[PDB]
Design an enzyme around this catalytic site. Structure first.
Site, mmCIF file in Angstrom:
data_model
loop_
_atom_site.group_PDB
_atom_site.id
_atom_site.type_symbol
_atom_site.label_atom_id
_atom_site.label_comp_id
_atom_site.label_asym_id
_atom_site.label_seq_id
_atom_site.Cartn_x
_atom_site.Cartn_y
_atom_site.Cartn_z
ATOM 1 N N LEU A 182 40.517 30.378 53.776
ATOM 2 C CA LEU A 182 41.008 30.205 52.416
ATOM 3 C C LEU A 182 41.644 28.833 52.215
ATOM 4 O O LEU A 182 41.443 28.193 51.184
ATOM 5 C CB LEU A 182 42.006 31.311 52.067
ATOM 6 C CG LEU A 182 41.482 32.739 52.248
ATOM 7 C CD1 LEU A 182 42.573 33.763 51.973
ATOM 8 C CD2 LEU A 182 40.271 32.985 51.359
ATOM 9 N N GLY A 183 42.408 28.380 53.202
ATOM 10 C CA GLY A 183 43.069 27.092 53.113
ATOM 11 C C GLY A 183 43.510 26.556 54.460
ATOM 12 O O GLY A 183 43.397 27.238 55.477
ATOM 13 N N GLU A 214 45.964 27.041 59.644
ATOM 14 C CA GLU A 214 45.114 27.397 58.516
ATOM 15 C C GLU A 214 45.532 28.729 57.905
ATOM 16 O O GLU A 214 46.468 29.380 58.371
ATOM 17 C CB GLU A 214 43.648 27.488 58.951
ATOM 18 C CG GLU A 214 43.324 28.744 59.754
ATOM 19 C CD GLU A 214 41.833 29.023 59.847
ATOM 20 O OE1 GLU A 214 41.041 28.236 59.289
ATOM 21 O OE2 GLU A 214 41.453 30.034 60.477
ATOM 22 N N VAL A 215 44.825 29.122 56.854
ATOM 23 C CA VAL A 215 44.996 30.429 56.241
ATOM 24 C C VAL A 215 43.619 31.055 56.103
ATOM 25 O O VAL A 215 42.679 30.407 55.641
ATOM 26 C CB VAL A 215 45.655 30.327 54.850
ATOM 27 C CG1 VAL A 215 45.639 31.679 54.151
ATOM 28 C CG2 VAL A 215 47.078 29.799 54.972
ATOM 29 N N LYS A 250 48.223 33.638 57.665
ATOM 30 C CA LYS A 250 48.548 32.241 57.907
ATOM 31 C C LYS A 250 48.717 32.004 59.398
ATOM 32 O O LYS A 250 49.584 32.605 60.031
ATOM 33 C CB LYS A 250 49.826 31.859 57.162
ATOM 34 C CG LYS A 250 50.132 30.370 57.152
ATOM 35 C CD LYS A 250 51.297 30.079 56.222
ATOM 36 C CE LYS A 250 51.403 28.602 55.903
ATOM 37 N NZ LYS A 250 52.261 28.372 54.709
ATOM 38 N N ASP A 295 57.988 22.501 45.685
ATOM 39 C CA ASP A 295 56.633 21.952 45.576
ATOM 40 C C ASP A 295 55.782 22.719 44.574
ATOM 41 O O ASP A 295 54.650 23.106 44.869
ATOM 42 C CB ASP A 295 55.939 21.932 46.943
ATOM 43 C CG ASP A 295 54.769 20.963 46.991
ATOM 44 O OD1 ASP A 295 54.715 20.048 46.142
ATOM 45 O OD2 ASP A 295 53.904 21.109 47.883
HETATM 46 C C1 YM8 Z 1 45.571 29.358 50.940
HETATM 47 C C2 YM8 Z 1 46.811 29.011 50.113
HETATM 48 C C3 YM8 Z 1 46.725 27.501 49.977
HETATM 49 N N1 YM8 Z 1 47.920 27.089 49.223
HETATM 50 C C4 YM8 Z 1 47.953 25.636 49.012
HETATM 51 C C5 YM8 Z 1 47.892 27.786 47.929
HETATM 52 O O1 YM8 Z 1 47.974 29.421 50.859
HETATM 53 C C6 YM8 Z 1 48.207 30.756 50.694
HETATM 54 N N2 YM8 Z 1 47.290 31.539 50.105
HETATM 55 C C7 YM8 Z 1 47.532 32.845 49.933
HETATM 56 N N3 YM8 Z 1 46.643 33.668 49.362
HETATM 57 C C8 YM8 Z 1 45.428 33.341 48.891
HETATM 58 C C9 YM8 Z 1 44.953 32.031 48.878
HETATM 59 C C10 YM8 Z 1 43.698 31.763 48.341
HETATM 60 C C11 YM8 Z 1 43.185 30.470 48.329
HETATM 61 C C12 YM8 Z 1 41.926 30.230 47.789
HETATM 62 C C13 YM8 Z 1 41.179 31.280 47.264
HETATM 63 C C14 YM8 Z 1 41.693 32.571 47.278
HETATM 64 CL CL1 YM8 Z 1 40.764 33.879 46.624
HETATM 65 C C15 YM8 Z 1 42.953 32.808 47.818
HETATM 66 C C16 YM8 Z 1 43.481 34.092 47.843
HETATM 67 N N4 YM8 Z 1 44.682 34.318 48.351
HETATM 68 C C17 YM8 Z 1 48.777 33.359 50.280
HETATM 69 N N5 YM8 Z 1 49.702 32.586 50.820
HETATM 70 C C18 YM8 Z 1 49.456 31.281 51.015
HETATM 71 C C19 YM8 Z 1 50.457 30.443 51.612
HETATM 72 N N6 YM8 Z 1 51.249 29.770 52.080
#
Ligand code: YM8
EC number: 2.7.11.1
Length: 246
Positions: free
Chosen positions: A8-9, A10-11, A26, A106
């Site tokens: 998603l984003g 590490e995440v 995360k 932020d």
């Molecule tokens: C991934 C983000 C990046 N940040 C910069 C917002 O960091 C986080 N994301 C979370 N949920 C999440 C992120 C998504 C990102 C993209 C797409 C979809 Cl569907 C997503 C669904 N759910 C939860 N906590 C954090 C944290 N910390």
């Protein structure tokens, strides 16, 4: 067990093998992010489920709506009623945080997520900190955030109040939502776009694309002196903030 389905984003998006429930995991200052998350419980704040130390793992709400950033059409923004709704929910979240003495530090569209119903949720407390404790306010002095969203006092003063900084960044988010662009690289006098705003040249973009009602609110939020800057309770009394829309 949870299957790590995609990054998603590490995440990474994790999905429950039995129930098919989705969460954001995360994978990793981290100690404070966990601590701060433990304090948080509000419908406009990304839910925290828990953590595990193996490389640290944070279990956070999956917001299938994506990032607010992707609802903003470049140079256009979004329908004003949608912007107002997102702004209401952002204020609700920010109000909550400040109420428990937490500052996010932020606030920007990348850090504002949307759930399946498009409810806004404040995400990422890696930069957050306690600014009020035992009913005593602590001034901040560390510079952090994201330049186009940061308040000018952060660049100009040794110490500053936490809350007006979050309020400012909310103002920049609102601008972005209504105009599909950021007003300046940074709130400094060496920045022409910032000077123009201070000179009230609102016949220029992005202000030109913004209706007079929301623009009036922006005039009150994006005030250089943090002590003269509108507070949240007063944002709640603002005309546009209270305007029925759609
Ligand atoms: C991934 C983000 C990046 N940040 C910069 C917002 O960091 C986080 N994301 C979370 N949920 C999440 C992120 C998504 C990102 C993209 C797409 C979809 Cl569907 C997503 C669904 N759910 C939860 N906590 C954090 C944290 N910390």
């Amino acid at each position: 067990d949870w299957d790590l389905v995609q990054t998603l984003g590490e995440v990474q998006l994790a999905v429950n093998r039995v129930t098919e429930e989705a969460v954001a995991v995360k994978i990793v200052n981290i100690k404070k992010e966990i601590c701060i998350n433990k304090m948080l419980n509000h419908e406009n704040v990304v839910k925290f489920y828990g953590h595990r130390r193996e490389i640290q793992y944070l279990f956070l709400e999956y917001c299938s709506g994506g990032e607010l950033f992707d609802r903003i059409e470049p140079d256009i923004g979004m329908p004003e009623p949608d912007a107002q709704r997102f702004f209401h929910q952002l204020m609700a979240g920010v109000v909550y945080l400040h109420g428990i003495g937490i500052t996010h530090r932020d606030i920007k569209p990348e850090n504002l997520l949307l759930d399946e119903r498009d409810n806004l949720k404040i995400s990422d407390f890696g930069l957050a900190t306690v600014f009020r404790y035992n009913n005593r306010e602590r001034l901040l002095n560390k510079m952090c955030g994201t330049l186009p969203y940061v308040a000018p006092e952060l660049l100009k003063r040794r110490e500053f109040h936490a809350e007006p900084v979050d309020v400012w960044s909310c103002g920049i988010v609102l601008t972005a939502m209504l105009a599909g662009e950021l007003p300046w690289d940074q709130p400094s006098d060496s920045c022409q776009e910032y000077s123009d705003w201070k000179e009230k040249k609102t016949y220029l973009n992005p202000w030109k694309k913004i209706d007079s009602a929301p623009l009036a609110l922006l005039h009150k939020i994006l005030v250089e002196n943090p002590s003269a800057r509108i507070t949240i309770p007063d944002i709640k009394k603002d005309r546009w903030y209270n305007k029925p829309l759609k």
